[PDB]
Amino acid sequence: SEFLKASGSNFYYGGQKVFLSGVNFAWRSYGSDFGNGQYASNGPALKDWINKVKASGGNTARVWVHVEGQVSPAFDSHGFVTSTDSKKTLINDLSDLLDYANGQNVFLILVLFNGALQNNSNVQNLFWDESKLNSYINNALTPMVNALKSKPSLAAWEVLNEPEGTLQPGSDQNSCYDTSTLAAQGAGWGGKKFPMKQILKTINWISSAIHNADSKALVTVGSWSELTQTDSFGYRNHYKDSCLTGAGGKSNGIINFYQMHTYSHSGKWNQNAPFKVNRWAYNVNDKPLLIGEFASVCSQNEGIQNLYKYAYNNGYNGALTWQFNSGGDCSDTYSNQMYGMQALKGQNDQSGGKGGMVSVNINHHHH
């Protein structure tokens, strides 16, 4: 069966370039959607939400899993992972959602942990303790990967969301680790916990083990801003192969596609933010680039649909609104998030530089 691949600048499914059009859920219940039998409550709403996506001609949902350790993964008193969740429900809960999504021709991006906020000590120590990280890997992650890797609906795994949130900025000879410009750009807002080195080592080890278990699996990391995923404009791409691989020494611990998130401040984009610019401008054409989050309501009033269209026409490999449950700062309405996806209902253009296939026919699970 066919899965979503990433090759050069593009996503491919079934031989053809594809653009990821859709939304972030990103949860129904924050960190308690899956595990500890919590999916029986949460699942019907997010199945509905996945229905709302196929209906609107969208093809992707980004949805959060461990988050801040609220339910997953399960830790013993010494801070070692015993399992997926104490009721050992997570893998089936995800399995269910992935099977449903498939039926609606929607791809899922599963995001493992939050880095924007990460108020849980046991997770925090995964960044520092090599043995405790391996407990995560061995007792939760590898088993999650092995059960879910035959599921074509699973487009990609995201290790960590907005790592810059809990980043500890500071200098370092090696420029993969130097983040001395970021503090005044506002990183560290979740508290300054981790140096880039630990961040990158942590995500390196984690990717490595996903790839170990599922060779064709797609891994990403969603930065809070353009600032940290391009070498252009005097910025730094902190997540290029060289950097990750040199942090944790695991050679296949890479991301397969980049991902920026983007929001205006007081109605004004950053200078070289994605809707200001080209994907090509980011000089990052080795890998696909996804606009992982954005919202009409923190934009420059271009209007959701022109936003969807801008991303498709200016080289990006997908665009995902924030967020369907409609809650929090800079979140669109689930409704005009649907309006937005309609802007790309028909599309398939294989022309270089234009976006590709949107409505995808996702094959089933085979055994």
From Swiss-Prot:
Residue numbers binding substrate: 64, 125, 128-132, 161, 168, 185, 189, 224, 263, 265, 322, 329
Temperature dependence: Optimum temperature is 30 degrees Celsius. Retains approximately 20-40% of its maximum activity even at 0-5 degrees Celsius. Drastic loss of activity at temperatures above 45 degrees Celsius, at which the half-life of the enzyme activity is less than 10 minutes.
GO BP annotations, alphabetical order: mannan catabolic process
GO CC annotations on file: extracellular region
Protein name as annotated: Mannan endo-1,4-beta-mannosidase
Self-association and partners: Monomer.
Gene3D superfamilies (alphabetical): Glycosidases
Effect of residue 265 to A: Slight reduction in substrate affinity and minor reduction in substrate turnover compared to the wild-type
Bilayer-crossing regions: none
Annotated control of activity: Activated particularly by Ca(2+) and Zn(2+), and to a lesser extent by Na(+), K(+), Mg(2+) and Cu(2+). Activation effect of the divalent metal ions Ca(2+), Zn(2+), Mg(2+) and Cu(2+) is reduced significantly by the addition of EDTA. Strongly inhibited by Mn(2+), Hg(2+) and Ag(+).
Lineage: superkingdom: Eukaryota
pH sensitivity of activity: Optimum pH is 3.5. Maintains more than 50% of the maximum activity at pH 2.5-6.0. Not active at a pH above 7.0.
GO MF annotation list: mannan endo-1,4-beta-mannosidase activity; oligosaccharide binding; polysaccharide binding
UniProt subcellular location: Secreted
Known uses: Potential use in mannan-hydrolysis industries which need especially low temperature and an acidic condition such as the food and the animal feed industries.
Spans annotated as Involved in stabilization of the transition state: 327-331
Active site: 162 (proton donor/acceptor), 293 (nucleophile)
PANTHER family the record matches: ENDO-BETA-1,4-MANNANASE, GLYCOSIDE HYDROLASE FAMILY 5 DOMAIN-CONTAINING PROTEIN
Function comment: Hydrolyzes 1,4-beta linked polysaccharide backbones of mannans. Has high activity toward locust bean gum. Also active toward konjac and beta-1,4-mannan. Hydrolyzes mannotetraose (M4) and mannopentaose (M5) to mannobiose (M2) and mannotriose (M3) with a little production of mannose (M1). Hydrolyzes beta-1,4-mannan to M2, M3 and M4. Hardly hydrolyzes M2 and M3. Does not hydrolyze p-nitrophenyl-beta-D-mannopyranoside, gua-gum, carboxymethyl cellulose, soluble starch or laminarin.
InterPro entries: Glycoside_hydrolase_SF
Catalytic reactions on record: Random hydrolysis of (1->4)-beta-D-mannosidic linkages in mannans, galactomannans and glucomannans
Taxonomic source organism: Cryptopygus antarcticus
EC number: 3.2.1.78
Keyword annotations of the record: Carbohydrate metabolism, Disulfide bond, Glycosidase, Hydrolase, Polysaccharide degradation, Secreted, Signal
Hydrolase is among the record's keywords: yes
